[PDB]
């Protein structure tokens, strides 16, 4: 009865990057076709605009400060990880009998002997890389076949990036032009195996696209007409069409819920090799709309009718929605999202009225940076980020430092989604939205206690995954392509 | 045989304003539905980003400097107008027997006794206003019923805005909340009369939306969820759905070509009461992509198949395309556009490879400001505009003055449609695009001779239209609502 679930989570992809969100040159025909037969969200969000914290919020339905996923993101030598006590979506569904699987980027911790890898947090199967694909040296990797090198090098002084199969190293580094096919094959098998055992599957496809450095297999190389970023986006888009073909082929169309979104806004610092936030301001790394507002599609033929909703939703709402849809019961913890099944099925409205945004480097004295209620968004603190540099708007740059705003900066996102015209720069509607925004910030800051930081537990180079355990010299002896 | 033609031309409407071009809150379901069953252009342009010149280019297929339509726009007291010798699209079709009609804004000159009004340039019928609706005082007009006044006042010291029926004043001023219905009724009659006489009609619907000040009839007032700009946009969108219903009702669906575009980018100076260029830079008044790149839809069921083209097209190409489609012969003059029927019908490619952009205040020493060839656009001169002020990008402001660029600023619009990353800030592809752009600018500047300016022939207040001819005191005695 419970539907099969496929959750596709792109990386560093902006609001204005899909064809259906208005980009003029992107090539994304399969995602356009899922939008044309599904529910396209104009106002969907992540609460924090960096990789680790966004991934924590999606899998647990909880604000990332609650379990210590701040500040910044995890690195290969990190001791910390998403605590084992947190209950992930995969745990929830596994318990109700789903065959659960994951392909792609994890970025929730590796840890002493791989204690924080996906196999320990509810996934029966896992093929992927434990953190971003640029967190290891890439000056010798090929990003586009036959022999176009990845640009710029990536992180230095580290072990090459490992492709893992559950807890084992399958390759190190892997061959980037072929990851996609490896991942389509793993997905195909998980589906067919679940069909064979009469059980609902759960696939978590965390693509590496469209994070730096860009890479694609040879059928996309130089075919998109938007350069490397396009080629990579187009391969993501062809992976989606492949999952949808597999779904067809097994007669699972009307029995599978498919959701597509992305962790955080675009890295405009990669300039024309990075994404596009469309009309929204800034990108990755900030609490402006361009870093937290993501594309989001939901497609379940015969259940979700084609259309466009403007209602509020968050990545935080998808554990509780998915639990509801599968008759699985919610963990016994404070959850920050809601069930959106009425909205999806067309019998209700979203229960969500407010959204709370924390910065990359949060703290307990300052609290949440921005809050949206209804159509109004208030910024109490503002800040630019090096991930959002190089555009003409100077509020996005790393040189725009932390600035308190009292009274906050106040925007009407229905008329001014671009965040240009501060409404307090008076009216009764406004003054009443101002008092509610202030009360919601003070209530949340008074009730949330931050979990102790996982990222500040430091680093240990000995925690790095090595294909040839005990070899020497570390890290470059660690490799087995 | 020749199809019926309906040409809808919006006012001050940006690339990112329709739902189908990605806006998050606009309400435009009828335009979304024409896009979903028609050809949506991602790269369509006007050559000059102001009202008069754009309107001249569309009706004549010629660069506006050729017949003196510069600098700036015409005003009510202007002596000048689009010369009578120019052959307009309406002239072309009338000669092949179309019943030709026009509703809405003309802005191509009034002149001594109305010599330049539409009835003299090929339209059998005309109901509309001879220039923009803000070019007369509006502090006492109602923009939204029952009694919401137009905001800010409009131009002072002038006659109220006249609604004309051919050459006669029907009302002065007209009641803005009802213009739309007046215009739907005129369109309905022109269609049915043409059906009755067995003849092809040509309708030219130059809406006042979404120019300042905004206004709508009462079914849209406060219903769009994007405020006044939205209400006005939504009424434009409901007028389109009305024309399409009328087309249905007479069984003319498969026999009518319908084209939708707009004169120029958004007036961001009206802030949240003005339009949105999406990911493009700046707006009205500039030669950046946000002022010259417009939305554009073409819909002719059973002839134009649904889709998206990225090929180059201009408003300049639509006299010659429309002549071709109706078997009417081209005037005997140098034309700057091309026939796009192959592209529309799906048998060819656009013949257009290059686009030439002039500024609002052109001159013969400087020549064209920017040129696009293929994917590359070069800016030889750059300039901001008061119509594009108030955003965060300082290149759009009136304080960014005229700056020569040598070598030009060079952008790859397929990877960088936002015009952020100057590619000469080297490569053989680039250096060859640079030499071609430079040669195309020098060829065009050497071959075009500017026609003597119509706008500099001055003003005469006695040329103002008056409902009560000879009355006193002028201009406020001129009125007959
Ligand atoms: C590693 O871990 C999982 C779990 O054991 C492997 O398990 C699957 O492998 C085969 C089918 O692919 C079967 O032998 C097992 O039944 C199956 N187990 C479950 C619970 O499905 C898996 O192959 C490895 N992970 C992947 C796919 O890389
Ligand atoms: C003014 O000018 C035109 C042309 O005379 C008027 O003409 C039309 O009016 C009636 C139908 O609407 C008929 O009496 C005429 O046949 C018809 N003429 C043509 C050539 O179509 C018209 O009513 C006025 N313009 C409008 C519609 O306002
Ligand atoms: Mg990311
Ligand atoms: Mg205009």
Swiss-Prot record, chains A, B:
Changing residue 276 to Y: In MLD; juvenile-onset; causes a severe reduction of enzyme activity. Changing residue 101 to R: In MLD; juvenile-onset. Changing residue 390 to I: In MLD; adult type. Changing residue 226 to H: In MLD; infantile-onset. Changing residue 372 to W: In MLD; late-infantile and juvenile-onset. Changing residue 194 to P: In MLD; loss of enzymatic activity. Keywords: Calcium, Disease variant, Disulfide bond, Endoplasmic reticulum, Glycoprotein, Hydrolase, Ichthyosis, Leukodystrophy, Lipid metabolism, Lysosome, Metachromatic leukodystrophy, Metal-binding, Signal. The modification 3-oxoalanine (Cys) is found at residue 51. The metal cofactor was first identified as magnesium ion, based on the structure of the recombinant protein, but when purified from human placenta, the protein contains 1 calcium ion per subunit. This is Arylsulfatase A. The lineage of its organism: Eukaryota, Metazoa, Chordata, Craniata, Vertebrata.
